[PDB]
Structures are given as structure tokens and as C-alpha cells.
Amino acid sequence: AIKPEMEKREKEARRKRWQEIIEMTERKQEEIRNGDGKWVEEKEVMGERTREAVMEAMKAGAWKDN
Amino acid sequence: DDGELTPLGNLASEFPLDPALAVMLISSPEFYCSNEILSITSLLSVPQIWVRPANARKRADEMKAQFAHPDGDHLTLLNAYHAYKGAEARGEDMKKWCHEHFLSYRHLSSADNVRAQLKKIMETHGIELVSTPFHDKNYYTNIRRALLAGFFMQVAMRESSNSKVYKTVKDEQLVLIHPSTTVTTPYEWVVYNEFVLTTKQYVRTVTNIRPEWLLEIAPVYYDLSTFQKGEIKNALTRVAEKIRRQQAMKASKA
Amino acid sequence: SESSTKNAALTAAQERLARFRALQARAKESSQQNLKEATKESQRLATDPSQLTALSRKHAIAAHKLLKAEIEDAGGDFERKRAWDWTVEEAERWD
Amino acid sequence: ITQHNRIWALYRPFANSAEGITAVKIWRRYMQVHPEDAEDFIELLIQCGLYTEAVKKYIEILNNPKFQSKNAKGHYELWSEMVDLLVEHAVDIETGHETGIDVERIIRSGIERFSDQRGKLWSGLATYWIRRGNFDRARDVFEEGITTVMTVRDFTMIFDAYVEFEESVIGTLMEAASRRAEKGVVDESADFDLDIRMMRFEHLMDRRPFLLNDVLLRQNPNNVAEWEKRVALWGDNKEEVVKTYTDAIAAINPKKAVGAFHLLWANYAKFYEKAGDLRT
């Protein structure tokens, strides 16, 4: 009574499982195809520090360009 | 401290929103980003406007990337609201534009109505409405400072440089970032508007902020004298000591 | 003349502000694209290409299983359809 | 000397309460007797205003290969401390061989030592030079680091610092030139100077992807796609296209290539063929 329906169940279980394995492989392929925190806040802090340097430079009159 | 309601508490009770949103709207006049902060608070009060259908997940992701901002999810939502307002001013259909950009027209209208109600309440209470210039580079920093002042309680810090798991200071909660976040690079401090507990602990609606900015926004909550465990509070105390040393150097040089 | 010089300076300053805004926008776009390029420097320091060739191998074998599954699901003979493509050297080795 | 331990232990809170030049004389003698609290003396020098002696102390303590920071500060943390103090007080540092301070030499030593934060050290040197006000030398060392950087991250944080610095200074001179322009004040030092600054910025920003491709190929001299992108950026200039292709041919190992060398060679051959040259 149970054998054909569990045969079908394991059949589409195999199908869905290795279909999902496939889909993981193309999602990693797309991740490669299109390719940190201390980094980005270091960039932001040097940007604000460079701005502060700019304002103090023309507040003190540091024009020595050529 | 005695439980008595102050004028700020009375204003928060009069404003039909959360106490954190009311505090953010009150502190936005100091950050000079009152209109943007009111729009963000209205969008947070209204339901989620991002639509991600199963059959249109790629289109929804493309629309979110087009309307997203690198400063944070709150910045992305503000940019989406600004784009919707610009489309409405230009004369495009709001529902058609929301369907094309995977947005919710009803949620956008509710956010606009909540923003109008908040602006009316601010005009009744005498709260000034100011907005920083678009060409000014301090607009995003002012918006982040206003968001940190509004929601400094829900702030998370990364555990390590090699680990993406963040540690919210609220009872030392180990969580992650939600997949719907528009921030490609995680921040040192993430101010989270909503925390969702699931099989994977993730935090949604996260905006970038620094520990020094958070301590300047909320010195009482982030006090190093009353700071408990652990290393996140130690790093906050180290940042406060560095800021104090910088202030001492500036005072010596001035 | 001085009014003409003032008008020329005003138009030049308007062009200068337009150039400033365009340079700001181009700098922001370049900074975003180059942060993405940093993620390619990283994320390939994460994805050392040996793992990429390995996942390509799993893709190939699982896609082979799938293709065989729909061939005998439609009812065709997968081995006859491949028999149209075996070479002489391969066939002798298989025998 | 044996009782000097007790005597100094009672002496140092008097310095911490008295502060100032008296306290730094005290703690100089305390370094003469017992060198352990270098970070505390750094804090006193920063508070007092003796950053030249602080830089000399930095050099001495880092030269001594035995100091361990009690605040868990590593070698790079100390290097950040030197560059931060130098950039915060550039005008208070007396350079020359008499004081032993050479900012360019110490930062280039940091460049050749700590290659991970080479862009950070280049940005620190440039920001030190703009704190001093030597904008042309800042630009010279800036382009030197741009040409001699091998990291895309370092190159692009350097260019972001360039964008911020030059944008802010030209903005300040927008207000200067405007407020001189309602009253009609203009000369060669303002209008022609602004024209040549924007000429420099536009052509350097157009040459920025060329330098980005150069940094990418210096990082990896096998990226066929990068060489194709660089030569497409070169565009219609035939001699430059020919020389960039020639460098591509005598630059990529065929066994270590990571692209389509066959497609690159096909583009080279079809370029000569569609131009004029069937024999080659």
C-alpha cells in the first residue's frame, strides 16, 4: 500500500535536493561574477580630520601653493 | 529620577509616536536635520514599504539597489521617500511608481500623512524645522548623530574584524545584520530601529554611527563610570579617553 | 568696464559650481565602485579559486544528474543519446 | 639607590598633582631611574605642549626593542600615535638634524616596514604637509605615493583624501573669489589660478582610472581583463595602444594567466588587421 507513494516521495526528494545544490552553485557563481568596518570608519575619520586641517589652514593663512 | 513627567515627557506624550521617535524629533533641531528626521520617524511609524515578491525578487532587489544609500537602511528609506516625493511633484502616478520601484503606495501615503501630522505638531509646539544642504558633506553625519541621539539604546558593535556578528549593548545581545539591509560594509556602530528574533538573530533598519558620536549624543546612557561588562564598553571608554586627549591637545594648541 | 567683468565672473563661478557638483558626483561614484573593487580584492582572498573549481565540479555533476533525470523522464534513452557522441578511443576503452 | 624606590614612589603623586614643566622635569628624572610609564609621560607631554620632546621620546622608546605598552598598544598603535600627534601639531614640531626629527624619513620607514597601512601612512604624511601648509610638497609626495602604491584600497583611500582636501580648499576659495567678485576684485592670482587648479583636477581625475589600472596590474601582472580595460581606456591613441599591448605580451605568464590570453591576442591581431597590416 505504501511503496509507490514513498517511491515518488524519494524521487522528487532527490530532484529538489540536487536542484537546490545546483541553485547554490549558480548563486556562488553570481557572487563571483559580481565579486571592512575599521576600514570605513578610518576613511571617514581621516576625511573629517583632513577637512578640519583645511579649515585651520585657511584660518591661520597657510597659502603656500605653487 | 523620581518618576515625575518633565516637559520632554509631556511633549513625547503629546506627540502620537514612540518616546524614542519623539526624542529623535526633538533632538533633530540641534542636528539641523529636522525634516529628514521627521520623515524617517514617519516611515518607521508607518509599515514597511519595501515589497519583495517571490516571482519578482530580482526586480525588487534591483529597485532596492537603485533607491538604496550606503550610509544605512534609514538613509536608503529616506532616499526612497525623497524619490517618491520627487515623482509626485513631477506628476507620475504614485501607485504606478511604487509598483515599478517595488514600493508600497499605501505605506508611502501613510508615511506622508504621519510626516504631515508630525510637522503640524512641531509647528504647534514651536519646534523649528531645519534641513542641511545637499551639497554640504555634514548632512549625513548630522542625520547619523540625530539617529544616534534618538535610538542610542539599540546600538550594536561588531565583536571582531573577522566576525560579522554584532553585539547590541541592550543586555549584551549577540545578533547579526538582516539580509534586507542596504549597507554593503558593516559599521563600527549600528543603530537598529527594529530587532527581530528568529532562527537566525538579525537586526533590521541599521544606520552607521561611531562610538564617539554615540557617546556625544547620549553621554548619560553611554557613561563609562556606570559602564558594565564588557569589552564593548571598554572600547567605548577607550574612545572617550581618546576624545578627551584630543580635546586636551586642542586646548593646549588653542 | 567693470559690470561686464562682474557678469563674466558670475557666469564663471556658476560654471565652477557646476564643475564642483559634477566632480563631487563622479568622486562619489568612483569611491563606491572602488569600494566594490576592494570587495573583489577581499571576497577573492576569501574565494581562493580552488573552491571555485570545486563548486564548478559539483555544479557539473549535479547538472549531469538533472539532465539524465529529465531525459528518462521524457522517455528518451540517455545512453543512446550519448552513444551518438562517444569517440572511437573512448568506445574501445569502454569495451 | 635602594631607598630611591620608596622615595620615587612618594615623589610621583606630587608630580601628578603639581603638573606642568616641574612635573615633566620630575618625570624625565623618573625615566632616568625607571623607564616603565612611557604612555603616561606621553599624556603629560601632550597636555603640556612639548610635542617635539614627545616625538624624540617616541623615537627613543620605539628604538628600544624592549618596551611593552601597559594599555595593550601595539607597534602599529604606537605608529598611529606618532602620526596622529605629528598631524595634530605639525607647526609645533621643530624638524632638522639638530632635533633628530625627519617626518618624511620616518613615514617612509613606516611605508617600507608596515605595508598593510601604507595608504594610511601616505595620507598621514599628506595631511601633515597640509597642516604645515606646504601644499605643493603635499601634492608631490601625494603623486609619489599614487605612483608607488600597489594596493587598490590604499590608492582609493588616498584619492578620497585628495577629493576631500582639494574640494574643501577650492570651496573656500569659491567664497573668497565670490566675496571679491561682488566688489569686482580679480587678478591673475585668483581667476587664472582657479582655472589652472581646475585644469589640474580635471585631468588628474580623468587619469585616475589609468592609475587605478596601473595599481591593479602592479598588484597582479596576470589580469588579462585588467589589461584589456586599461587599453580600452587608452582608446584611439595608436602608439599607446601598441605599447600597452606589447607590455601585455611581455608581461603575462601564459601558464599563470588568469584571463583569456587568446582573446587578448585576437584583439591585438584584429587591431593590426583592421588598421592595415596583413604581413604582421
From TrEMBL, chain A:
Belongs to the SDE2 family. It is found in: Cytoplasm; Nucleus. The lineage of its organism: Eukaryota, Fungi, Dikarya, Ascomycota, Pezizomycotina. This is Uncharacterized protein. It comes from Chaetomium thermophilum (strain DSM 1495 / CBS 144.50 / IMI 039719). The chain holds residues 164 to 235 of 325 of the full protein.
UniProtKB/TrEMBL annotation, chain B:
This is RNA helicase. Transmembrane segments: none annotated. It is found in: Nucleus. Belongs to the DEAD box helicase family. DEAH subfamily. DDX15/PRP43 sub-subfamily. Pre-mRNA processing factor involved in disassembly of spliceosomes after the release of mature mRNA.
Automatic annotation (TrEMBL), chain C:
Residues 1-8 have a biased composition (Polar residues). It is found in: Nucleus. Residues 12-25 have a biased composition (Low complexity). Involved in pre-mRNA splicing. May be part of a spliceosome complex. Belongs to the SYF2 family. This is Pre-mRNA-splicing factor SYF2. It comes from Chaetomium thermophilum (strain DSM 1495 / CBS 144.50 / IMI 039719). The chain holds residues 69 to 163 of 326 of the full protein.
Automatic annotation (TrEMBL), chain D:
Residues 39-252 form the Pre-mRNA-splicing factor SYF1 central HAT repeats domain. Transmembrane segments: none annotated. It comes from the Eukaryota. It is found in: Nucleus. Involved in pre-mRNA splicing and cell cycle progression. Belongs to the crooked-neck family. Associated with the spliceosome. This is Pre-mRNA-splicing factor SYF1. It comes from Chaetomium thermophilum (strain DSM 1495 / CBS 144.50 / IMI 039719). The lineage of its organism: Eukaryota, Fungi, Dikarya, Ascomycota, Pezizomycotina.
